[PDB]
Amino acid sequence: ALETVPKDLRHLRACLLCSLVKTIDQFEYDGCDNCDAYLQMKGNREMVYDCTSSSFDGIIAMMSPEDSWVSKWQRVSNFKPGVYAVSVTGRLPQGIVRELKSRGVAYKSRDTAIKT
């Protein structure tokens, strides 16, 4: 859709769960689409900065996760089409990751990149 496509290249962040890359205005207004009920991101900016981090590299034009080896490798097949990444560096604090497992959300590390 036209709401997930980034509008302006400047001031762009990325999520850590599904690695959704968009613009800060879209994050403030729309927020994380693939995970909204379990993230409660819409309607605020503090949570955006708390969870999302600008430390990420790589951009991929995901359009058909159901049929794509990149989608299988990144484990993003069950997500909506959009502009994702391949490496997002960061980790959620110890106050928000706890409830995801209780609500039945498996928190995995999307930082597929290597260190040294």
Partner: protein, 141 residues
Amino acid sequence: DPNLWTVKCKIGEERATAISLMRKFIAYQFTDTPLQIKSVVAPEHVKGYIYVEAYKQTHVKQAIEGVGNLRLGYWNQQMVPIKEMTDVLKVVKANLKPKSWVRLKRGIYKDDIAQVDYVEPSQNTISLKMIPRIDYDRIKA
């Protein structure tokens, strides 16, 4: 499994090309001439050409028609082996973490190592730790 093709591009324009392709796909997805491309990879480390995912060469050849940026890489479509389908996504250590060591290009402390202390969420300025090198105004006039 789908194949990965390569297409040349201008040096310094990769994210612009990616967003333009996304816009074209979104605008021409509900028409009689859709795009069969699966995805495109534009690694940050590389600069000068981009990747594309498709089965056949004709798909991308007819999907990159009309765009004035990929005109250069239109008469040749190179195919890479299947073993190179996993090294492209690899990244060697983004690169923004507090209490890390970074170097400077501009200013006076050129080609010197320094240390990050605090990061502003505004993404406009960042603190840095370095030992002064000035002469304390004793040599200069």
